[PDB]
């Protein structure tokens, strides 16, 4: 894990502030809960830059939950089965 | 104040000279510096003795005298 | 009307400029009267319009109380224009790359399209255009210098003529500037240099600023400052026109300098690029908003005291002292199915364990006190009552440093109904997982209460998964001490008196 | 104007389980509990007609409560009121301190601000009702509100009327479009049979620019149309039937076209000059032929819906006497 | 000549809708087993809607949410169904994956 | 006041802290749910309200009717966000700066028909 | 400490996704999960046996005489390829490591070793007669087990179809195929009836999908912690036997430092010729 992250650009590439800004630069919130968070705020703006949110840092820092473990995939009902199965309250 | 030898339970009014008291372990006016509250502390499990050689060891059962090898 | 579940899928950061401060603007501040009686005053910058602090009074943008408004954003009409103090590099870049007489580059666009475009402005302004002539214009490009005692001051010497760059002919500068230009140097429209001065800066909402301090000094909060610069914007002439080659009056340049650095210390004072309270002074350091508050929180429903061992406990298992079980609340809702077996907690009460502490009634959207409940209070399908924590009930145990995913694990909860145990108990062959010792060391517990997060507690982080290590796929848990040795004793085929055996008796005595 | 609008949203499903036993059903029945009678997306939604698309019952995954939600893209009908638009009764809330206040009781709610500048407006008298124009402005659909907010005057017809110049000639696939208006006509039209023919006179009369006596319906084979002093004595054209007879390749009307005051807005008579020898104060407006035939089509429209509406609002000659100042008013600006 | 910068807002385009499209069934190629996290899920929310609304399909009678859910799980009776989100195209799809859990496999969780 | 979580240890009656080392073991085992227990419902947690035609905080009030975009005067399109009053007064903060926080709300997804 | 936090946000993002790949918002860090999307708590170590045999120990121990057939040679000659990729694969970690040595030991997700000895104690029945039928069958189904075995990284549905397999999907279950190989050979399961084999076949299956690694799983901050904890160890252990010091070389490691900051510097040079390796006094020269 640590190699493949660390050459994934073709380049080999730090564990460190410019090693991530390299791997995920439009990672904003991410590489601001890192260090430096007015430098990389005041760069964002400059930029412009559109933040996908993904991971962990982001999604914590926007203050909903990380997209893994048991949230990764989604659940919906199962309109057949219930219809099926099941009668409305309104009996 | 309150009566020296009162019981200070948890969430009383204790006026001094900090009524709120909420250490959760019962205590008792000593006086009315002043309103002193003390606990009568025994040996607790819990509680760390050491030999005077170091050896910190905390107190994790207590028996009766029947029970004791 | 009903705001449907969404959740944010990117955020887009941009320049503000005051277009968008006046558009989103509840209020306007006007007034520099703090208080009008116990109610905020009007057109201060503690209007109520922008969000409450306190239970006296609501929103009155959105009607919610304390909680449950986010704050309202505001506005405040500066008299004479203002610099961003975020942004202070890009306006100098800015001012290097652009004929100050008229809006045409006085760059080569194609000496720099081949770059990639954050990187293209940065390298027209590090390219020397000190003494450059405009193609449109026959003006001379200036030199630019920054002064040396604020980082907010620009001036412009020209064939050794010392002039200052007030914010307003900044403004006009940068007003000249053409859409290509901006998108041929890389920036994008949205950062057009014009938007880097500030007519109307944005009053942050009350939520930012709880400290009011009603209620009747030495500490310093951010309200002081934005008082401060909204007396001296009153003080500035609300008319007052600057032009490229004009002097002013000693004591205006000295109040629209002050004023200036009022907005800087504002935003950015103790930032590096003791009385110092600055918005960007919150986000930085491990004690900052960003790690102590947004990464890490402070929770209810949890508890701490000393560890020890209990040799009766199974691995999965911890000796939670019954005051701790009588604390912490598990919340079931009221069913046909769970009615029989929450009734005898209903009916404890808070007199005698297992009982409960508080009943949430579903027609009434209200929580009510076990204690003082009224005799025609009943447990209807829907109400939610909050027990509490019996024998059986999975907890989250957990000693810090957390260095491994073994660090937080699920246990069991055995409720240790003797008064005086006041100690989480664990085997010691589980402190393997916790890497922890007799010894004085302390750990945290809290019971999942949320349907949920009981399920997943008991499925997924059960300490039952923790036992091959992550980091080495070998066994974490084993004997250790006196389990080795009396194994080995056990197991040993002969003993001093002669051979290894026992009788009938105590071969059953072993295993009771 | 009703008219067809698609929307998208979220619903919370606050019991998932439940409403999953028949999604049509509920899906339909917490559109309306929601939305049908509130202002959303620059419209008033009159009743929910059908949902075209909807997703699966998806379950909130930041909060720990075990809701659902649900897309859904339904197709109402809206009604959008434009500026100039006629309103037959607009009761009076409250006139006193020089505010004047009124609520429309037609289909398409919407409280109108009447302004006191205006002598006619101060005549008003709450309680009654009176026939409104909505302003210049734009309606403001407030999002969530029960009803429009707009503001207009008491209806003085204008004598200033504006031409259009014609220069592109209307294109067959423009044609489509416009027939769709026309076809808003025609139903307009046929309603307007129905209404006694004695009551639509005695307001037509009274909203003409110029004062008529007792004629000859200039009848049509469309609509028995009323009569009106000739201008120029100009031949009238039936736009309803020009664009029946573009239909048959008669699409020329590149020449000039108005609608003098001398004609009943009603009636779909156009003069259509081929110069412009009109009285047009302001120069004629250079326009598409689509733009001009929309722009004079719509009102058509906008004055037969208010002819019609004017009988149904006043149907007994209790009312029409209740309100006899209004009337009078009317007649101090005829001309 | 001299232009205004326009605000945010106006520029902002939101994002255009996206179609559900669900890859056919004999063309997936994830997994026909629950992950770990996938069954916590699943018994989780089933549990929740239990506290909910009481009604279930199944036999037997359990006096908590949590048991009536894992044994809907793990007797095939759980009324949920699991999306896994392969790809949203740029072109305004969103490529999903539709697995029936009374059909998939169940892993070891006890 | 200004975050609404808990206040701190034992001496102020507050909570406990979670710190980021909590986190990270708790993201490694997956356990989400237990995350957004703690950390919202036993914290700060919010319910915030953003327009999906401009992507900036939105009002809303239900029991006193409220549905309004300030950017968006008409065409307002509310939706509510699950959040933590902590990122919400962050973003506020951001803002203070004249950094225009924009929030692009996940799109509407629907069947083919 | 420092570095703890450092390597958690720079691995945060690597999250296992729906093909069982590691990536940071769809760009790719690994095609699978450590190359064989394996769980790290679902390992334990087993022994190969044919990789430091001799050809004529690895006829005389695997050859299996018993039905003169093309089949037992097929299978004699699969078990040799196997033998020889492994020696040649891992003779090549030595040739680019300064110590790293050749091991029989690899860390799999199914002990088939253990599978077989319970079976065959469970349902003993002794020496089963010569079935002639039997064994091919039994051969038969070890072989389309093997072929299929990459599906266990899709769902059943594409191995009923029998759609094309990824290349890199092979790749990663080649290892289990050969310990399959090895400890399913004809002679070894000669006792084992067919429905003795295909319980193991299932129970092997069965052991494999549960070792896979989950979808939602942050890998990358296991990754971090794993080896953030046995540096704190090195950063002791190294002082007492301190360039090379605890904390010079990991930064060096994991701040890409370029050669000129490089300290401890070494290679590892190699005579030209096998021969003159051996002497040391050519070598000191
Ligand atoms: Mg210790
Ligand atoms: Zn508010
Ligand atoms: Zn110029
Ligand atoms: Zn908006």
């Given at each position: 894990?640590?190699?493949?992250?660390?050459?994934?650009?073709?380049?080999?590439?730090?564990?460190?502030?410019?090693?991530?800004?390299?791997?995920?630069?439009?990672?904003?919130?991410?590489?601001m809960?890192?260090?430096?968070?007015?430098?990389?705020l005041?760069?964002?703006?400059?930029?412009?830059?559109?933040?996908?949110?993904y991971?962990?840092?982001?999604?914590?820092?926007?203050?909903?939950?990380?997209?893994?473990?048991?949230?990764?995939?989604?659940?919906?009902?199962?309109?057949k089965?219930?219809?099926?199965?099941?009668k409305?309250?309104?009996? | 104040?309150?009566?020296?030898?009162?019981?200070?339970?948890?969430?009383?009014?204790?006026?001094?000279?900090?009524?709120?008291?909420?250490?959760?372990?019962?205590?008792?006016?000593?006086?009315?510096?002043?309103?002193?509250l003390?606990?009568?502390?025994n040996?607790?499990?819990?509680?760390?003795?050491?030999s005077?050689?170091?050896?910190?060891?905390?107190?994790?059962?207590?028996?009766?005298?029947?029970?004791?090898? | 009307?009903?705001?449907?579940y969404?959740?944010?899928?990117?955020?887009?950061?941009?320049?503000?400029?005051?277009?968008?401060?006046?558009?989103?603007?509840?209020?306007?501040?006007?007034?520099?009267?703090?208080?009008?009686?116990?109610?905020p005053?009007?057109?201060?910058?503690?209007?109520?319009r922008?969000?409450?602090?306190?239970?006296?009074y609501?929103?009155?943008?959105?009607?919610?109380?304390?909680?449950?408004?986010?704050?309202?954003?505001?506005?405040?009409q500066?008299?004479?224009?203002?610099?961003?103090?975020?942004?202070?590099?890009?306006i100098?870049?800015?001012?290097?790359?652009?004929?100050?007489?008229?809006?045409?580059?006085?760059?080569?666009?194609?000496?720099?399209?081949?770059?990639?475009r954050?990187?293209?402005?940065?390298?027209?302004?590090?390219?020397?255009?000190?003494?450059?002539?405009?193609?449109?214009?026959?003006?001379?490009?200036?030199?630019i210098?920054?002064?040396?005692?604020?980082?907010?001051?620009?001036?412009?010497?020209?064939?050794?003529?010392?002039?200052?760059?007030?914010?307003?002919?900044?403004?006009?500068?940068?007003?000249?500037?053409?859409?290509?230009?901006?998108?041929?140097?890389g920036?994008?429209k949205?950062?057009?240099?014009?938007?880097?001065?500030?007519?109307?800066?944005?009053?942050?909402?009350?939520?930012?600023?709880?400290?009011?301090?009603?209620?009747?000094?030495?500490?310093?909060?951010?309200?002081?400052?934005?008082?401060?610069?909204?007396?001296?914007?009153?003080?500035?002439?609300?008319?007052?026109?600057?032009?490229?080659?004009?002097?002013?009056?000693?004591?205006?340049?000295?109040?629209?300098?002050?004023?200036?650095?009022?907005?800087y210390?504002?935003?950015l004072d103790?930032?590096?690029?003791?009385?110092?309270?600055?918005?960007?002074?919150?986000?930085?350091?491990?004690?900052?908003?960003?790690?102590?508050?947004?990464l890490?929180?402070?929770?209810?429903?949890?508890?701490?005291?000393?560890?020890?061992?209990?040799?009766?406990?199974?691995?999965?298992?911890?000796?939670?002292?019954?005051?701790?079980?009588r604390?912490?609340?598990?919340?079931?809702?009221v069913?046909?199915?769970?009615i029989?077996?929450?009734?005898?907690?209903?009916?404890?009460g808070?007199?005698?364990?297992?009982?409960?502490?508080?009943?949430?009634?579903?027609?009434?959207?209200?929580?009510?006190?076990?204690?003082?409940?009224?005799?025609?209070?009943?447990?209807?399908?829907?109400?939610?009552?909050?027990?509490?924590?019996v024998?059986?009930?999975?907890?989250?145990?957990?000693?810090?440093?957390?260095?491994?995913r073994?660090?937080?694990?699920?246990?069991?909860?055995?409720?240790?109904?003797?008064?005086?145990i006041?100690?989480?108990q664990?085997?010691?062959?589980?402190?393997?997982?916790?890497?922890?010792?007799?010894?004085?060391?302390?750990?945290?517990?809290?019971?999942?209460?949320?349907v949920?997060?009981?399920?997943?507690?008991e499925?997924?982080?059960?300490?039952?998964?923790?036992?091959?290590?992550?980091?080495?796929?070998?066994?974490?848990?084993?004997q250790?001490?006196?389990?080795?040795?009396?194994?080995?004793?056990?197991?040993?085929?002969?003993?001093?008196?002669?051979?290894?055996?026992?009788?009938?008796?105590?071969?059953?005595?072993?295993?009771? | 104007?009703?008219?067809?609008?698609?929307?998208?949203?979220?619903?919370?499903?606050?019991?998932?389980?439940?409403?999953?036993?028949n999604?049509?059903?509920?899906?339909?029945?917490?559109?309306?509990?929601?939305?049908?009678?509130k202002?959303?997306?620059?419209?008033f939604?009159?009743?929910?007609?059908?949902?075209?698309?909807?997703?699966?019952?998806?379950?909130?995954?930041?909060?720990?409560?075990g809701?659902?939600?649900?897309?859904?893209?339904?197709?109402?009908?809206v009604?959008?009121?434009?500026?100039?638009?006629?309103?037959?009764?607009?009761?009076?809330?409250?006139?006193?301190?020089?505010?004047?206040?009124?609520?429309?009781?037609?289909?398409?709610?919407?409280?109108?601000?009447?302004?006191?500048?205006?002598?006619?407006?101060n005549?008003?008298?709450?309680?009654?009702?009176?026939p409104?124009?909505?302003?210049?402005?734009?309606?403001?659909?407030?999002?969530?509100?029960?009803?429009?907010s707009?503001?207009?005057?008491?209806?003085?017809?204008?004598?200033?009327?504006?031409?259009?110049?014609?220069?592109?000639?209307?294109?067959?696939?423009?044609?489509?479009?416009?027939?769709k208006?026309?076809?808003?006509?025609?139903?307009?039209?046929?309603?307007?049979?129905?209404?006694?023919?004695?009551?639509?006179?005695?307001?037509?009369?009274?909203?003409?620019?110029?004062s008529?006596?007792?004629?000859?319906?200039?009848?049509?084979?469309?609509?028995?149309?009323?009569?009106?002093?000739?201008?120029?004595?100009?031949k009238?054209?039936?736009?309803?039937?020009?664009?029946?007879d573009?239909?048959?390749?008669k699409?020329?009307?590149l020449?000039?076209?108005?609608?003098?005051?001398?004609?009943?807005?009603?009636?779909?008579?156009?003069?259509?000059?081929?110069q412009?020898?009109?009285?047009?104060?302001?120069?004629?407006?250079?326009?598409?032929?689509?733009?001009?035939?929309?722009?004079?089509?719509?009102?058509?429209?906008?004055?037969?819906?208010?002819?019609?509406?004017?009988?149904?609002?006043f149907?007994?000659?209790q009312?029409?006497?209740?309100?006899?100042?209004?009337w009078?008013?009317?007649?101090?600006?005829?001309? | 000549?001299?232009?205004?910068?326009?605000?945010i807002?106006?520029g902002?385009?939101?994002?255009?809708?996206?179609?559900?499209?669900?890859?056919?069934?004999?063309?997936?190629?994830?997994?026909?087993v629950?992950?770990?996290?996938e069954?916590?899920?699943?018994?989780?929310?089933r549990?929740?809607?239990?506290?909910?609304?009481?009604?279930t399909?199944?036999?037997?009678?359990?006096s908590?949410?949590?048991?009536?859910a894992?044994?809907?799980?793990?007797?095939?009776?759980?009324?949920?169904?699991?999306?896994r989100?392969?790809?949203?195209?740029?072109?305004?799809?969103?490529?999903?994956?539709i697995?029936?859990?009374?059909?998939?496999?169940?892993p070891?969780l006890? | 006041?200004?975050?609404?979580?808990?206040?701190?240890?034992?001496?102020?009656?507050?909570?406990?802290?979670?710190?980021?080392?909590?986190?990270?073991?708790?993201?490694?085992?997956?356990?989400?749910?237990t995350?957004?227990?703690?950390?919202?419902?036993?914290?700060?947690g919010?319910?915030?309200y953003?327009?999906?035609?401009?992507?900036?905080?939105?009002?809303?009030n239900?029991?006193?009717?409220?549905?309004?975009?300030?950017?968006?005067?008409?065409?307002?399109?509310?939706?509510?966000?699950?959040?933590?009053?902590?990122?919400?007064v962050?973003?506020?903060?951001?803002?203070?700066?004249?950094?225009?926080?924009?929030?692009?709300?996940?799109?509407?997804?629907?069947?083919?028909? | 400490?420092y570095?703890?936090?450092?390597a958690?946000?720079?691995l945060?993002?690597?999250?296992?996704?729906?093909?069982?790949?590691?990536?940071?918002?769809?760009?790719?860090?690994?095609?699978?999960?450590?190359?064989?999307?394996?769980?790290?708590?679902?390992?334990?170590?087993?022994?190969?046996?044919?990789?430091?045999?001799?050809?004529?120990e690895?006829?005389?121990?695997?050859?299996?005489?018993?039905?003169?057939?093309?089949?037992?040679?097929?299978?004699?000659?699969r078990?040799?390829?196997?033998?020889?990729?492994?020696?040649?694969?891992?003779?090549?970690?030595?040739?680019?490591?300064?110590?790293?040595?050749?091991?029989?030991?690899?860390?799999?997700?199914?002990?088939?070793?253990?599978?077989?000895?319970?079976?065959?104690?469970?349902?003993?029945?002794?020496?089963?007669?010569?079935?002639?039928?039997?064994?091919?069958?039994?051969?038969?189904?070890?072989?389309?087990?093997?072929?299929?075995?990459?599906?266990?990284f899709?769902?059943?549905?594409?191995?009923r179809?029998?759609?094309?397999?990824?290349?890199?999907?092979?790749?990663?279950?080649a290892?289990?195929?050969?310990?399959?190989?090895?400890?399913?050979?004809?002679?070894?399961?000669?006792?084992?009836?067919?429905?003795?084999?295909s319980?193991?076949?299932?129970?092997?299956?069965?052991?494999?999908?549960?070792?896979?690694?989950?979808?939602?799983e942050?890998?990358?901050?296991?990754?971090?912690?794993?080896?953030s904890?046995?540096?704190t160890?090195?950063?002791?252990?190294?002082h007492?036997?301190?360039?090379?010091?605890?904390?010079?070389?990991?930064?060096?490691?994991?701040?890409?430092?370029?050669?000129e900051?490089?300290?401890?510097?070494?290679?590892?040079?190699?005579?030209?010729?096998?021969?003159?390796?051996?002497?040391?006094?050519?070598?000191?020269?």
């Open positions: 894990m640590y190699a493949d992250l660390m050459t994934r650009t073709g380049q080999v590439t730090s564990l460190e502030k410019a090693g991530l800004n390299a791997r995920e630069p439009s990672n904003v919130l991410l590489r809960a890192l260090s430096s968070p007015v430098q990389v005041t760069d964002a703006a400059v930029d412009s830059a559109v933040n996908p949110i991971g962990i840092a982001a999604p914590t820092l926007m203050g909903s939950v990380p997209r893994i473990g048991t949230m990764y995939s989604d659940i919906i009902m199962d309109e089965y219930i219809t099926e199965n099941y409305s309250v309104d009996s | 104040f309150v009566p020296v030898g009162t019981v200070v339970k948890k969430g009383d009014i204790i006026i001094g000279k900090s009524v709120m008291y909420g250490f959760d372990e019962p205590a008792v006016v000593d006086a009315v510096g002043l309103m002193r003390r606990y009568e502390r040996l607790n499990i819990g509680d760390k003795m050491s005077r050689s170091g050896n910190k060891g905390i107190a994790a059962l207590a028996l009766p005298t029947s029970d004791m090898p | 009307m009903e705001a449907g969404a959740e944010i899928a990117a955020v887009q950061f941009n320049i503000a400029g005051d277009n968008d401060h006046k558009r989103q603007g509840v209020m306007e501040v006007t007034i520099s009267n703090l208080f009008e009686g116990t109610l005053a009007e057109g201060g910058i503690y209007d109520a922008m969000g409450t602090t306190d239970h006296h609501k929103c009155i943008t959105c009607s919610h109380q304390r909680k449950q408004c986010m704050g309202h954003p505001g506005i405040l500066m008299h004479a224009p203002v610099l961003q103090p975020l942004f202070i590099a890009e100098r870049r800015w001012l290097r790359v652009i004929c100050l007489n008229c809006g045409a580059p006085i760059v080569d666009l194609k000496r720099y399209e081949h770059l990639i954050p990187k293209r402005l940065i390298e027209a302004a590090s390219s020397q255009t000190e003494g450059k002539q405009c193609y449109v214009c026959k003006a001379v490009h200036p030199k210098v920054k002064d040396s005692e604020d980082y907010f001051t620009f001036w412009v010497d020209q064939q050794g003529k010392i002039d200052k760059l007030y914010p307003q002919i900044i403004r006009e500068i940068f007003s000249r500037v053409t859409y290509d230009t901006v998108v041929k140097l920036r994008s949205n950062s057009h240099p014009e938007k880097l001065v500030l007519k109307a800066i944005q009053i942050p909402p009350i939520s930012i600023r709880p400290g009011i301090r009603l209620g009747i000094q030495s500490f310093h909060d951010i309200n002081n400052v934005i008082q401060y610069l909204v007396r001296k914007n009153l003080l500035i002439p609300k008319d007052l026109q600057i032009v490229r080659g004009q002097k002013i009056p000693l004591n205006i340049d000295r109040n629209l300098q002050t004023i200036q650095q009022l907005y210390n504002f935003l103790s930032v590096s690029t003791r009385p110092a309270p600055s918005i960007m002074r919150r986000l930085p350091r491990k004690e900052g908003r960003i790690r102590k508050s947004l890490g929180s402070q929770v209810w429903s949890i508890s701490r005291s000393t560890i020890c061992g209990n040799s009766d406990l199974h691995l999965d298992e911890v000796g939670y002292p019954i005051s701790f079980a604390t912490l609340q598990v919340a079931e809702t069913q046909h199915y769970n029989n077996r929450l009734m005898p907690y209903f009916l404890n808070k007199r005698q364990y297992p009982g409960c502490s508080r009943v949430y009634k579903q027609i009434t959207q209200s929580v009510h006190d076990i204690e003082g409940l009224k005799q025609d209070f009943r447990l209807e399908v829907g109400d939610i009552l909050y027990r509490d924590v024998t059986g009930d999975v907890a989250f145990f957990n000693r810090q440093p957390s260095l491994e073994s660090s937080i694990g699920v246990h069991r909860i055995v409720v240790l109904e003797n008064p005086k006041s100690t989480f664990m085997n010691v062959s589980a402190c393997a997982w916790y890497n922890a010792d007799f010894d004085g060391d302390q750990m945290n517990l809290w019971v999942p209460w949320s949920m997060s009981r399920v997943e507690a499925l997924l982080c059960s300490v039952r998964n923790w036992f091959i290590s992550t980091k080495s796929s070998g066994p974490v848990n084993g250790v001490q006196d389990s080795t040795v009396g194994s080995f004793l056990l197991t040993r085929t002969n003993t001093p008196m002669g051979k290894n055996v026992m009788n009938k008796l105590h071969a059953m005595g072993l295993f009771q | 104007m009703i008219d067809q609008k698609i929307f998208e949203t979220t619903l919370n499903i606050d019991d998932p389980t439940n409403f999953c036993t999604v049509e059903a509920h899906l339909l029945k917490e559109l309306e509990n929601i939305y049908v009678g202002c959303f997306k620059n419209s939604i009159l009743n929910i007609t059908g949902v075209i698309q909807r997703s699966p019952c998806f379950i909130m995954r930041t909060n720990n409560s809701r659902g939600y649900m897309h859904v893209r339904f197709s109402a009908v009604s959008y009121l434009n500026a100039f638009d006629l309103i037959a009764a607009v009761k009076i809330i409250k006139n006193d301190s020089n505010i004047i206040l009124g609520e429309s009781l037609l289909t398409e709610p919407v409280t109108i601000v009447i302004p006191s500048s205006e002598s006619q407006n005549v008003a008298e709450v309680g009654q009702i009176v409104v124009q909505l302003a210049n402005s734009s309606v403001y659909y407030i999002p969530g509100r029960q009803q429009a707009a503001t207009g005057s008491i209806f003085i017809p204008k004598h200033t009327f504006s031409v259009y110049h014609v220069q592109e000639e209307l294109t067959q696939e423009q044609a489509l479009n416009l027939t208006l026309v076809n808003i006509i025609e139903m307009l039209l046929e309603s307007r049979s129905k209404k006694d023919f004695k009551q639509i006179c005695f307001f037509e009369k009274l909203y003409y620019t110029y008529i006596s007792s004629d000859e319906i200039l009848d049509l084979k469309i609509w028995k149309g009323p009569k009106g002093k000739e201008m120029s004595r100009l009238p054209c039936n736009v309803l039937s020009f664009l029946y573009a239909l048959k390749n699409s020329s009307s020449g000039f076209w108005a609608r003098p005051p001398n004609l009943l807005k009603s009636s779909p008579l156009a003069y259509q000059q081929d412009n020898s009109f009285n047009a104060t302001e120069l004629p407006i250079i326009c598409s032929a689509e733009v001009m035939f929309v722009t004079l089509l719509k009102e058509i429209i906008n004055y037969l819906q208010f002819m019609n509406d004017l009988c149904d609002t149907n007994n000659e009312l029409i006497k209740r309100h006899e100042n209004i009078m008013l009317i007649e101090q600006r005829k001309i | 000549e001299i232009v205004e910068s326009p605000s807002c106006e902002f385009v939101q994002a255009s809708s996206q179609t559900l499209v669900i890859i056919p069934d004999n063309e997936r190629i994830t997994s026909n629950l992950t770990t996290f069954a916590t899920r699943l018994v989780a929310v549990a929740q809607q239990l506290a909910i609304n009481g009604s399909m199944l036999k037997k009678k359990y908590s949410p949590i048991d009536i894992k044994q809907e799980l793990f007797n095939r009776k759980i009324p949920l169904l699991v999306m989100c392969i790809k949203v195209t740029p072109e305004g799809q969103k490529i999903v994956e697995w029936n859990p009374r059909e998939m496999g169940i070891l006890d | 006041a200004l975050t609404g979580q808990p206040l701190d240890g034992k001496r102020s009656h507050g909570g406990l802290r979670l710190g980021e080392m909590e986190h990270w073991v708790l993201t490694a085992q997956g356990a989400m749910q995350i957004i227990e703690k950390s919202h419902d036993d914290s700060d919010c319910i915030s953003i327009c999906r035609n401009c992507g900036e905080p939105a009002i809303y239900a029991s006193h009717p409220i549905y309004k975009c300030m950017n968006c005067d008409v065409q307002a399109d509310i939706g509510m966000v699950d959040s933590r009053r902590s990122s919400i962050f973003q506020h903060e951001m803002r203070a700066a004249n950094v225009n926080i924009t929030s692009v709300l996940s799109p509407r997804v629907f069947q083919p028909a | 400490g570095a703890n936090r450092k958690i946000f720079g945060q993002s690597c999250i296992v996704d729906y093909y069982r790949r590691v990536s940071i918002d769809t760009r790719l860090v690994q095609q699978l999960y450590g190359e064989d999307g394996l769980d790290a708590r679902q390992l334990e170590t087993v022994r190969f046996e044919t990789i430091m045999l001799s050809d004529q690895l006829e005389d121990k695997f050859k299996y005489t018993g039905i003169q057939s093309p089949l037992f040679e097929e299978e004699f000659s078990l040799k390829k196997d033998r020889d990729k492994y020696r040649q694969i891992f003779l090549n970690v030595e040739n680019f490591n300064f110590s790293q040595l050749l091991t029989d030991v690899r860390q799999v997700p199914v002990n088939v070793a253990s599978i077989v000895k319970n079976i065959l104690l469970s349902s003993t029945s002794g020496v089963l007669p010569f079935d002639e039928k039997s064994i091919l069958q039994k051969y038969a189904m070890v072989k389309t087990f093997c072929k299929n075995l990459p599906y266990v899709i769902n059943n549905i594409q191995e179809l029998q759609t094309p397999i990824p290349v890199y999907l092979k790749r990663a279950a290892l289990m195929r050969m310990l399959i190989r090895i400890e399913l050979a004809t002679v070894k399961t000669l006792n084992i009836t067919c429905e003795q084999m319980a193991i076949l299932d129970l092997i299956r069965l052991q494999y999908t549960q070792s896979l690694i989950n979808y939602g942050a890998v990358g901050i296991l990754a971090a912690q794993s080896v904890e046995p540096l160890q090195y950063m002791l252990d190294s007492h036997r301190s360039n090379k010091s605890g904390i010079v070389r990991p930064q060096e490691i994991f701040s890409a430092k370029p050669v900051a490089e300290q401890s510097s070494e290679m590892l040079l190699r005579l030209k010729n096998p021969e003159v390796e051996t002497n040391k006094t050519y070598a000191q020269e």
